[PDB]
Amino acid sequence: TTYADFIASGRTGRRNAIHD
Amino acid sequence: VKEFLAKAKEDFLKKWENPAQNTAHLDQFERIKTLGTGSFGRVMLVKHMETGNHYAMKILDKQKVVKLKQIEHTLNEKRILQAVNFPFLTKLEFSFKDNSNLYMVMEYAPGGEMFSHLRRIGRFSEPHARFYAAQIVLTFEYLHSLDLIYRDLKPENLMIDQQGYIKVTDFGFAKRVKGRTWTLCGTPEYLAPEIILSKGYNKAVDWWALGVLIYEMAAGYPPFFADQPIQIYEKIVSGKVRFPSHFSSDLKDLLRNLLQVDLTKRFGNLKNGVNDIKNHKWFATTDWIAIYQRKVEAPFIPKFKGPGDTSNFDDYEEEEIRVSINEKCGKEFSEF
Numbered sequence: 001t002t003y004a005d006f007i008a009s010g011r012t013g014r015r016n017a018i019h020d
Numbered sequence: 021v022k023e024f025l026a027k028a029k030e031d032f033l034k035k036w037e038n039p040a041q042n043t044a045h046l047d048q049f050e051r052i053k054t055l056g057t058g059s060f061g062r063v064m065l066v067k068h069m070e071t072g073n074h075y076a077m078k079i080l081d082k083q084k085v086v087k088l089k090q091i092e093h094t095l096n097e098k099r100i101l102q103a104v105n106f107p108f109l110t111k112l113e114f115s116f117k118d119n120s121n122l123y124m125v126m127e128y129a130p131g132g133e134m135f136s137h138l139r140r141i142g143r144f145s146e147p148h149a150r151f152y153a154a155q156i157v158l159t160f161e162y163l164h165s166l167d168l169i170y171r172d173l174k175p176e177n178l179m180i181d182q183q184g185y186i187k188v189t190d191f192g193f194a195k196r197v198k199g200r201t202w203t204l205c206g207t208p209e210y211l212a213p214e215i216i217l218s219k220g221y222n223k224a225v226d227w228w229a230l231g232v233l234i235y236e237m238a239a240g241y242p243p244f245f246a247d248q249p250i251q252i253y254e255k256i257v258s259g260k261v262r263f264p265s266h267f268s269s270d271l272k273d274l275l276r277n278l279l280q281v282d283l284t285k286r287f288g289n290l291k292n293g294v295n296d297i298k299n300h301k302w303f304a305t306t307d308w309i310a311i312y313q314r315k316v317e318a319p320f321i322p323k324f325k326g327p328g329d330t331s332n333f334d335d336y337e338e339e340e341i342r343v344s345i346n347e348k349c350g351k352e353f354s355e356f
């Protein structure tokens with residue numbers, strides 16, 4: 001499931017703003 | 021609305037052109053707990069001793085701001101937040117700087133981040149998501165009318181108050197701009213395609229970001245996700261999104277018009293402006309005046325327990341607030 005794929009991803013914690 | 025906004029602009033412009041400066045000092049506050057931390061700096065719960073009022077105090081290390089090339093952006097944040105006033109925004113109550121740091125003092129929202137509740141609960145019902153969305157639509161209408169673009173909508177930046185209403189905070193990338201702008205900024209999942217494609221862009225990126233937020237609130241995950249930002253960007257520009265089967269017809273239709281790569285068709289960006297959104301069928305049950313007036317019953321209210329209670333926030337390592345004996349970056353932040 002999409003939910004299962006999200007939860008297994010490295011991006012369920014707080015997301016940082018992009019740098020450059 | 022037009023009338024309200026006219027007067028709001030007059031109020032804003034006086035403060036925009038003559039910013040408040042040096043309106044408190046660190047020694048007037050008792051630090052209590054770190055509520056968040058990262059490249060944005062730190063935000064702490066503090067108590068103002070003379071009144072016993074609690075506030076959220078954002079602390080930026082001037083040297084760190086300089087290394088990150090965020091001088092002008094930080095000057096934007098402070099100048100904007102001291103000039104605005106809106107129910108679903110955290111305006112500055114005070115600001116000041118010392119040898120080492122910049123400080124911005126704002127209303128404390130004790131209910132925690134939307135991010136925390138969304139992740140724990142998993143997803144929000146459509147009525148729950150709509151209640152929050154309505155507040156963001158009104159806030160953007162306000163901000164945009166003042167020529168401000170927000171540029172970092174996400175659950176991590178939306179604080180829930182004691183009444184269960186929200187406050188948009190962290191204006192580190194907010195900017196007053198009448199034309200187009202070009203800075204590559206934001207959070208990967210929420211970036212409009214035109215930002216990724218390095219085009220000049222405008223306030224329409226906030227309305228795309230709203231599409232992502234509503235999707236995430238209702239689905240429990242964002243419309244474009246992957247393990248690394250590059251693969252997220254591939255999905256965003258591709259021109260395709262899938263909706264969960266539980267999304268209502270009206271929700272899907274709203275999101276197809278917000279998450280619209282074509283700027284001539286993206287809701288918020290058309291001739292009729294924000295009313296394409298306010299008058300969409302998904303918002304049919306929304307009493308916009310009652311939302312603004314905070315007369316609507318929140319579908320979720322946080323656990324009370326206390327005035328400076330912090331149980332709705334995560335625990336972060338507590339670092340010193342060090343103040344050098346030497347003034348750092350004085351010229352860079354002279355106007356702060």
Ligand SMILES: CNCc1ccc(-c2ncnc3[nH]cnc23)cc1
Pocket residue numbers: 014055056057063076110126127128129130133176177179189190
């Ligand atoms: C990424 N999130 C970091 C974070 C967490 C909590 C707050 C905050 N919490 C409570 N009240 C506030 N008023 C202004 N900001 C805040 C601000 C920033």
